[PDB]
Amino acid sequence: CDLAALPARDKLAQLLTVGVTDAADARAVVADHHVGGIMIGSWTDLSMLTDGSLGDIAASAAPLPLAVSVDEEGGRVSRLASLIGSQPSARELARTKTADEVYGIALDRGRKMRDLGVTVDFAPVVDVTDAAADTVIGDRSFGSDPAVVTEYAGAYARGLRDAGVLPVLKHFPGHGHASGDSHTGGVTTPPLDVLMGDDLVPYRTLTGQAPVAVMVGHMQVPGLTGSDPASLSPAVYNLLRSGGYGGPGFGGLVYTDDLSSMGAINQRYGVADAVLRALQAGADNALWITTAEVPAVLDRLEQALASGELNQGAVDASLQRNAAVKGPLRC
C-alpha cells in the first residue's frame, strides 16, 4: 500500500494527537478514528502502560503505527514519575550536574519510557528564563543563558534520542520571557528582534540534530504574529521552515501546544476551528487533551479541504512528516 492512497479522513486523523483518560478511551479513539497519536497526561489512568493494554492497542493500529506521547520533563512536569522515578527540575539539573550527566539521566529515563510504550516525549524545554521556580516555565527551563540552555537541553534531547524516544523542543519561538501563563489566557513575548538574540538561540543548533521535533506555543509575538497566537500564525511556521529564525530551515515534525484546555487558544477558538487554523498556518500535528471532539474535528477538516480553507498539499506534506518518524505502513 501507499501513503498517498489513504482515505482523506484517515490522512487527516494522522495529523491529530489526543489526550486519553484510560485504556477504553484510547482503544475506541484509535480503532474508530485512526488518530495518529494519543497523549498520556495527569488525567490518564496509567495502568494501561503496565497491564498490556497499550501494547495491544498499538499493535492493532493501522494504517500507521501509533505515536504515544507524554510530558516527561522532570521536576514539576513528570507525568510518569510514579513508574520511572522522580528527577530534579531542568533548572536544578543545570545547577548540580554536568551536561554529560544530564545526557545519561535522559538516556536512562528514555529507556524507562520506551519500556512503557512511550514513543514521543514533549521535552526538553528550550525556553530561556530567570523567572521564579514555580511559574509557568520557571524551573522547567535549563537557564537564563541561551548557551547554557543549548548545552543542557541539547544533552537532554540527545539522551532521549539515543533511547529511541522522539524529543520535542518547546515552546517555539520562546515562552521563557512571555507576559504570563498561556494556560489561562493570552500572553505576549518580547519582539522578534529580541527573540532573535536570545530565546531563539538554542533552536539554531538543536533543530539540526535529528530525529527531533518542535512544538510551537500560543504566545503572541510582536513583529511576527501580531495578535495571533504563534501556533495559529503562518508567520511562525514560515520562520521555522525558511531558516529565518537564524538556523537552518527545519523540515521535521512540528506540533502545537494544547489547543483545547489552554485559555490563550480556547477563549478565541473552539477545538475544531483551532485545529483548522493550526494546520492552515503550518503545523504538522494538532494536539489537544481530550478524544470527544475528534469526529467533529475531522468533519470540519474535510469541509475545509472542500472549501479550500485547507490545501491538499498541506495535508500531504504533514502526513509524510508524521510517517517519517514512525515505523512502516501496515497494509
Binding site for Na ion (CB under 5 A): 314, 317-318
Give me the residue label for grid cell 498539499. 313
| Residue 211 preceded by cis peptide, ω within 30 | yes
Neighbours of 190 (CB within 10 A): 20
Cβ 221 to Na ion, closest distance in Å?
Answer: 20
Cβ proximity to Na ion, 313 vs 331, nearer residue: 313
Rounded CA-CA distance 133/72 in Å is 17
Closer by beta carbon to Na ion, 163 or else 253: 253
Task: Work out how close the CB of 314 gets to Na ion at its nearest, in angstroms, rounded to a whole number.
Answer: 4
174 close to 189: Cβ distance less than 8 angstroms: yes
* Phi, psi dihedral angles at 88 (to 5 degrees): -60, 160
Minimum distance, C-beta of residue 284 to Na ion, in the bound complex (Å):
5
Nearer to Na ion, 103 or 255 (CB): 255
Minimum CB separation from Na ion for residue 321, in Å?
8
Give break positions in the chain: residue before each, C–N beyond 2.5 Å. none
- Least distance from C-beta 115 to Na ion, angstroms? 33
Residue 78, helix vs strand vs coil: strand
For 244-295, give the DSSP string.
Answer: TTSSPPP-S-EEEPPSSS-HHHHTT--HHHHHHHHHHHT-SBEEES-STTHH
By C-beta, is 149 or 314 nearer to Na ion?
A: 314
Residues 165, 310: Cα–Cα separation, whole Å = 31
For residue 200, what is the enclosing H or E element? none
Q: Is the peptide bond before 63 cis (omega within 30 degrees of 0)?
A: yes
* Closest residue to Na ion using C-beta atoms: 318
Q: Scanning the structure block, which residue is given the C-alpha cell 520557571? A: 138
Active site residues: 183, 257
Nearer to Na ion, 207 or 318 (CB): 318
